[PDB]
Design a protein around this ligand. Sequence first.
Ligand SMILES: CC1=C(CCOP(=O)(O)OP(=O)(O)O)S[C@@H]2Nc3nc(C)ncc3CN12
Ligand SMILES: CC1=C(CCOP(=O)(O)OP(=O)(O)O)S[C@@H]2Nc3nc(C)ncc3CN12
Ligand SMILES: [Mg+2]
Ligand SMILES: [Mg+2]
Ligand code: NA
Lengths: 802, 802
Amino acid sequence: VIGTPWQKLDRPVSEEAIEGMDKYWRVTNYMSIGQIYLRSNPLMKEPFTRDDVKHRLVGAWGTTPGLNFLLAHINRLIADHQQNTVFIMGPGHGGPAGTSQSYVDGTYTEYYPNITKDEAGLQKFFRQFSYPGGIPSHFAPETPGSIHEGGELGYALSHAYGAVMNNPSLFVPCIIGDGEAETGPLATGWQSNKLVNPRTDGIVLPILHLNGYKIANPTILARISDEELHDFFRGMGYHPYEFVAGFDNEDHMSIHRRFAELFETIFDEICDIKAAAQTDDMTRPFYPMLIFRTPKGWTCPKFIDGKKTEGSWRAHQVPLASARDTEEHFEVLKGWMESYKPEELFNADGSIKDDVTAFMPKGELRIGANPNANGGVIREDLKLPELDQYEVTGVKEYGHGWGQVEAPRALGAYCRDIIKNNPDSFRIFGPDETASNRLNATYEVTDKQWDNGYLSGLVDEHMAVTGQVTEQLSEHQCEGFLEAYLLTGRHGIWSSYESFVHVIDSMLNQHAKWLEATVREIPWRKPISSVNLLVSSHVWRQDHNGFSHQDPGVTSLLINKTFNNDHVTNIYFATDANMLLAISEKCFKSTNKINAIFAGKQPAPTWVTLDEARAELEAGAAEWKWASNAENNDEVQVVLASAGDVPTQELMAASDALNKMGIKFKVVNVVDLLKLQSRENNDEALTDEEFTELFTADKPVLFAYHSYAQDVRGLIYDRPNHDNFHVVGYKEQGSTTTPFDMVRVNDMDRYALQAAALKLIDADKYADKIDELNAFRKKAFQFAVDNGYDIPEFTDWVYPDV
Amino acid sequence: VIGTPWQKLDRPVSEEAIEGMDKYWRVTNYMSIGQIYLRSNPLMKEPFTRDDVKHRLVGAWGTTPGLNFLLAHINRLIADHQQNTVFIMGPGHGGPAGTSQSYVDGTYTEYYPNITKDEAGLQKFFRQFSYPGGIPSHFAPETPGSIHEGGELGYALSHAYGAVMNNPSLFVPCIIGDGEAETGPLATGWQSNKLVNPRTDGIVLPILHLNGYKIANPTILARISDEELHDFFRGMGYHPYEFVAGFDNEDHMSIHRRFAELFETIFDEICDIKAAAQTDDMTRPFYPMLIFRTPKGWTCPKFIDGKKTEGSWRAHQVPLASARDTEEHFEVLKGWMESYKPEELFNADGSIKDDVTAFMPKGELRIGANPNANGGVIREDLKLPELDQYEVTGVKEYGHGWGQVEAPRALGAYCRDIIKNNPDSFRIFGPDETASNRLNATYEVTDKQWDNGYLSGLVDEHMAVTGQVTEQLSEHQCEGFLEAYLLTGRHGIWSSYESFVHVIDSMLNQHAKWLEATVREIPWRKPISSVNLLVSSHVWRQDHNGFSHQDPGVTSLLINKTFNNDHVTNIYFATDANMLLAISEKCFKSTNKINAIFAGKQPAPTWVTLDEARAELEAGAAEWKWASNAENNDEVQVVLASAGDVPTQELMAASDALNKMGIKFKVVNVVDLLKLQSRENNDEALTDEEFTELFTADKPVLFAYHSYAQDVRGLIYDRPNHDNFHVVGYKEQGSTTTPFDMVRVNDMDRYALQAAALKLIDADKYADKIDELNAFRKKAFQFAVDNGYDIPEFTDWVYPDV
Ligand SMILES: CC1=C(CCOP(=O)(O)OP(=O)(O)O)S[C@@H]2Nc3nc(C)ncc3CN12
Ligand SMILES: CC1=C(CCOP(=O)(O)OP(=O)(O)O)S[C@@H]2Nc3nc(C)ncc3CN12
Ligand SMILES: [Mg+2]
Ligand SMILES: [Mg+2]
Ligand code: NA
């Protein structure tokens, strides 16, 4: 247990805590300005001149003094209440507030020994911010205390609420920009309070940083009436509190006392809610939220060159753009830095004075030190059930190609038992698709958690105020809740219809960026569990839907995060349920990855046994010798290769026909896509020798790919024999139609694959056969048109091994 | 002018209109069930049996009777008030309500002559829905009345509000699913009422289709208290009205009278607001919105197999999944279809009776016929200013490589004058980035439109309650408002920082899908203006930002919509401002496209004159002969090729050095990326002959690409000499750093490009030179580290022609 969770003080905040908060605010404003502006002379020692100012002034001031003020108060709260706390910096361009917080709390020097608590360390700290060879401008993963960089705005609330799930002792004050709140993902994130339980989860306090402006405009929420703003937050299930300061001549000490009193009222309300939830965990409370209204750039010069800067969008980026080049800007910068009276805040040796930090929390309660902000320190391996009990044994009993299994059902049973063995640290998220994607065996041991109204057992089923599945119709929610659940040390999986994965392409990009930086150069940030995403209801089988819903292209996006041997991104094609089991076990063991797991949920053949799946997954791509009819690679006339359940089924059927014609070939299945890249691009890929062994040195390769052919063409560009691959993929063709028609119109159907193999082998010799196969495709299409279902010869085919 | 906009009735709805609405509701419910279930015998003529039921039951019933009810009432309103109206079907899986609406209003038979108003046309209409060779399951672009297919939920409100901008006579009732409202994009779409003006724009009525459920769960908004739900809509600037029906034994005629009375109250309020706005167009009104609470699947069987179906998520998809296979399901289907009493709704010849449609609107007021729902019928070409006045003449006066122009400033001046010439039909959207991306010359002739609070001219600048620029910090808003502005026949452009384009990858995918279907097989849906997106503040120059903000990967996504010679997607690299002018003119003339226009906003050289830019754009890729030093392709030792402003600058500098060494080369710039694809993949690309002429038959090609090398490798896979291309692109390397460092770490800097050229030519001979160039790169990096700015020899280089 960290600290003493949810304790009230029952005494006023001390005057000494008020004095310390004002010193914190002054010193963190001072050092945030130092980071932006100063390449040397951090204490302004004689002579202090333009030569001390950076040549490239970069970073963001406007949000920063508001964050510094909130961080003083959150620090005071954590210390007084001993409260286990992670904050979220929504406006992550306020990085200098977050580096300052860590430098003050002592974690910065602990993690970065060269940046010492003295004049020399302070000079280094100022120069390195947003500087070549230095540190980022945003609240990046290399900053102690961050689980959210906040460069791409919108995810602050989903990360806050995912952090508190199954984390009943954790408090997350979530600082949200008022520009940020105009984003879609932020706007829906407020609604998460219907999906958490006040007894079994922790508590988020949203704090709207209502500073009136974004970069070049006021914000929507800052200019609507007070009555609408309060109605809005009350309508989303919060009790809104509002603080206003900095717009008149109120002295700063008065402001601190008034805020501390308010923040104690609010925290008391949170403690009452946590106490009450021990007895009534079914009534959803109105959680407090805070409207924090202060002038953007607070405490900077009110006017610069005749233009209003404090209290304006003009304070957003870097005021005094001429601070190095003109004596006029320089003198303004000088008076601004001096207004914080740094001579009272630092000792002559440049260390921050003891009376600046005596109010601060200590040890693992520090923001920079709490292990929830470095969740791989808390993470334990899952207790995984044995895989063999889930195996589809039909392949071993009856033959390759057996049965009509819906592949994700096996992963559902596996997930069910993972939750049973790990009952508060593995969650399933889904955008109203968990049952649709066949993972609902999990409901045998837990419920979908819903903390909103119930009506009747005639409609409410597998649903309770606490449980380990969470659904909301928002991919942004599911992805953000999961990412934070992982970043604070837990585990899970979510599922999505494949084309809708693209709604969160940019969140996958941010998490891939977080992982890249981390595996490269942040070794104190320990490994977290992987994002595991079941990508199902795919392009080939969108029975109730249609053309608009056919887009397997997240493959292509994930290919753009496969560099530098980071190994943070995997693309897997689950050929069948036994392969899906073997991929899932590997994903659930893995850390510091995004794993995209492609699987079909439609009834489909099972091709491999579980032992075969384990070996083939490790290699990445495998010959299926039992399906090849060639003696060796020299006797091969064509390599039949596929990735994805549906291209594999069609390729297999083509192989059966090609065999019956006397054509010699081998069959190769590809599961771990990026293992096709060359070793130069991927030091864990197939060597050239292993790749030639599979694909031959010089025979044609027909490659039936689940997604856009582009992906495979680009990946194998420097591979031996790549000129001989003919890659058939989805090509933006389809409608709402039968299964045969969907493959037919992308030349993916067995008949067209058989034809393409023949064309690659001898187009002249097989001209007539190719015509007949293309006419069979029309006849099968006409059959579907006339009769309402596909031709039996197509649907009823079973591989001859069965 | 269409109809008589914003007129009140001042009399009760007639009883005859009530009778007609109930008949409409009954006949559209009946035909929606016919579309889902019946392959023949649409009037249930003796014998009606299981053999008439479809073999594959696909589609969505739950939303549909609620849409059918609203469409009866919206139709009655349009007819009585003569009101110019487009609706949005948020729950676009309710396609059968939308096809039914068009069949009833007569547009369906007008657009599709084979689907006649009689028993034979009705049989065809039922069979074709979601059927091979037939029509989509959703409200697709092939349905008269659709501007929004609603398969990927979330964009209903942004499309509604973009439809009404500059459209003061248009009314848009926007039907929003209650599941849909849990999405991010929908949640922020409510806030659009702060960005429209009640005098110069039209009016959206949001109607929340609060049917209590999504696919397998209740919805958040349906289970919160009434008091929170109303506070929520009042807090977002609406006057909420609520209707509840279908949960008790109230007779349907009573329900229609009560709704018609309510909808007249609401429309009266909208007319009052429109009248008042003629005098006070500065006060933002509280626009009505409607909470419509009715049982999901309303009028279907209450229980099926002992399970509650009406009023449940169980009604979402297809009830009676056994209707063809069991007599038990069949008898339930039969009694359900009969409950609507089709014998009163159709004549013996199968035509819909006259008394079913006498209340309906006629002519261009019909939902299916209104030209706002087929905006290419209304669209006129822009009155474009002459391009030559914007030209950067420095190239002609002083030489190739001249000056320090910020390229988008020229497009800003061009846009300024387009707005001047087209003052109510060309809009600019931006996510708080219009000024940042340098398009703010537009503010010389218009303002950012903001219909929310003002404070002071010290902060409010270039901002008014009416204007042709709209900004909100949401890419989903900017993209959705623009798409609808185009779909209703107007024009525009938006700009985004490049990495944030990925927030709306999936909206680009939906609009590309809409365009693909349309150019292929919907010739009555006339061409609309293109989506034009200025992609700027790119990967190479993110001065205040950092690693997290470096992702030019929308290229790769757009490559997945380049099929079938649809020609709906363009990727352009603006080499400089004159090229940006020539690309922009082409984009602003073009129709039925998405145009991604890549340009740097940092000060940069200008390479080509405007005449050169016009020719080179047309070809797609061009030798720059004035920069090549080789006599002919046989004397070329390496082809220096680039796409993007920054790779071009670095390649050019490399060319200067290579020339000074005595190396023979040619320079080729690539603007229209997809013109690199082969003719087999793109019938408008360079022929093989033109491609070899540029890139040689067999010399090495060093290709410096703005984005991920993967894209170019895949595109040129079947091109002559492709094995000799070495593509250098962004490779996930960077930090917050100087301009030289960002190119350096992706091997994109001039020194590394010069080295790579030497390596391709003779790695042994040039081993030492390559070492020296790689050491210069370290020295330049160390200089940046020590000094705070890049080495003068890097920054001060100008191409020798200047
Ligand atoms: C407009 C924009 C920003 C303004 C945010 O203003 P605010 O939130 O009120 O913060 P503050 O405390 O400074 O006043 S930072 C941002 N990061 C972004 N993210 C996305 C998703 N799209 C665009 C940008 C561009 N950038
Ligand atoms: C859950 C989901 C749907 C339920 C929508 O329920 P509702 O809106 O209450 O409609 P109704 O009137 O039927 O009750 S349709 C949908 N389309 C989707 N779009 C996206 C962005 N992600 C997932 C899906 C999956 N699909
Ligand atoms: Mg702000
Ligand atoms: Mg619903
Ligand atoms: Na090749």
